[PDB]
């Protein structure tokens, strides 16, 4: 009928077992696994899905536990990948306790080390894998932003790879680029989509906001270098930016605001955000009030005056700027000296100087 077959159509018993596995008929699947002796657990749905994949896809944890105890059960790696994608934490825990992951080092070894051996571990059918072959469990969990699954995989030693520089000349990057050059760039985008997620950013590193700023600039440059995938790198950089913004958004007292803005008061992180153009971070009310308190250092009352009073003091500075400079040279440290060193008064002095300059330009054309 259909001019494509993705799965002779098994057996009546196999169809009944697949129905029981998909729809969570625990007693029937237990009975069959115990005493069938003609059925094979690797019988396949019409979509190419064995009993384990069907049970995991419908969140049947008890059926999953029953199937995992059956020796020579197939499609376990893809079962883990699917459970991670759907965020089924308990099914992920049950699959990870299987000898396939407990004895082996599947989660620790890199995607390339998994790919060098054929081993068809994360393959779900005769030919291919459900997600991209480079997408490891940790990368997939980071993609889906499953915080608990990311934490679990990090506990087991899984880490995202930090792809090499774009203009890289090492043998591995050279062979990857000569081989396909499209699977390579897509794999790079996948690894960066894993790195740029808030779950992995928060759970993986010591200083997630510094990592997020640096990675945001990294992806912003990647977007310019690789223009065909410009949108993807742009979205990932935006993810990093608003992660930093959301971390800043949670501060509740001045100590936390200082820790976020001053880095470890030189506003190092504010400088970095302006340099990398994380505009929502700098324009956020917390950073704004910090910068504002620094702006009116010694001008306690002036912070609240109407704009007319500040125009008044602008004019007064324009008038007394000769006397103010004379007094700065004469009495360098005083009330006058402390007021003269405040940043807002420095700015009004600059503005008044420029206005005097324009007034000289005009008055020179008098008569």
């Amino acid at each position: 009928g259909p001019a494509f077959m993705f799965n002779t159509s098994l057996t009546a018993e196999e169809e009944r077992f697949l129905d029981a596995a998909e729809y969570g008929n625990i007693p029937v699947v237990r009975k069959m696994l115990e005493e069938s002796k003609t059925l094979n657990v690797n019988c396949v749905d019409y979509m190419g899905q064995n009993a384990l994949q069907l049970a995991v896809g419908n969140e049947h944890l008890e059926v999953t536990e029953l199937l995992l105890k059956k020796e020579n059960l197939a499609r376990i790696g893809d079962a883990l990948l699917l459970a991670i994608s759907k965020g089924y934490v308990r099914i992920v825990e049950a699959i990870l306790n299987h000898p396939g992951f407990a004895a082996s080092k599947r989660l620790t070894l890199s995607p390339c080390e998994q790919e060098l051996q054929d081993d068809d571990f994360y393959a779900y059918d005769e030919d291919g894998t459900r997600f991209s072959p480079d997408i490891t469990p940790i990368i997939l969990a980071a993609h889906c932003q499953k915080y608990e699954v990311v934490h679990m995989l990090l506990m087991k030693g899984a880490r995202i790879e930090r792809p090499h520089d774009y203009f890289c000349k090492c043998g591995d990057c050279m062979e990857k680029q000569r081989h396909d050059s499209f699977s390579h760039s897509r794999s790079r985008i996948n690894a960066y989509k894993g790195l740029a997620s808030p779950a992995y950013l928060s759970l993986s590193s010591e200083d997630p906001v510094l990592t997020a700023l640096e990675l945001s600039n990294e992806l912003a440059k990647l977007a310019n270098i690789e223009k065909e995938f410009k949108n993807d790198y742009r979205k990932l950089s935006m993810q990093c930016k608003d992660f930093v913004v959301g971390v800043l958004d949670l501060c509740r007292d001045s100590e936390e605001v200082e820790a976020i803005l001053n880095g470890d008061a030189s506003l190092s992180r504010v400088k970095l955000a302006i340099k990398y153009e994380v505009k929502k971070f700098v324009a956020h009310p917390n950073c704004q009030q910090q910068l504002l308190t620094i702006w009116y250092e010694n001008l306690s009352g002036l912070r609240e005056q109407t704009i007319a009073i500040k125009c008044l003091v602008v004019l007064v500075v324009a008038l007394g700027l000769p006397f103010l400079a004379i007094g700065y040279w004469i009495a360098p440290c005083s009330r006058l000296g402390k007021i003269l060193r405040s940043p807002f008064m420095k700015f009004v002095a600059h503005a008044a100087s420029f206005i005097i300059f324009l007034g000289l330009l005009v008055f020179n054309a008098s008569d």
Binding site: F4, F6, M47, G48, D125, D127, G128, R130
Partner: protein
């Protein structure tokens, strides 16, 4: 019997069917999909209460035999 183009098209179209079903799972639930689960609960309730009644009547006949 199948050529590499046919195999690749088979792979891609199976991937498309699975991805399209996943994207269908990403649609907002509507009122009918919830009424279906309500009817699930209702039929389950009926079946379970009838099972309990079966147990009670069997215990009654067992008393009668005593």
């Amino acid at each position: 019997q199948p050529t590499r183009y046919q195999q690749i098209m088979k792979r891609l179209i199976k991937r498309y069917v699975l991805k399209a079903q996943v994207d269908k799972e990403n649609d907002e639930v509507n009122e009918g999909e919830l009424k279906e689960i309500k009817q699930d609960i209702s039929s389950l309730r009926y079946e379970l209460l009838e099972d309990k009644s079966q147990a009670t009547e069997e215990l009654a006949i067992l008393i009668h035999k005593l």
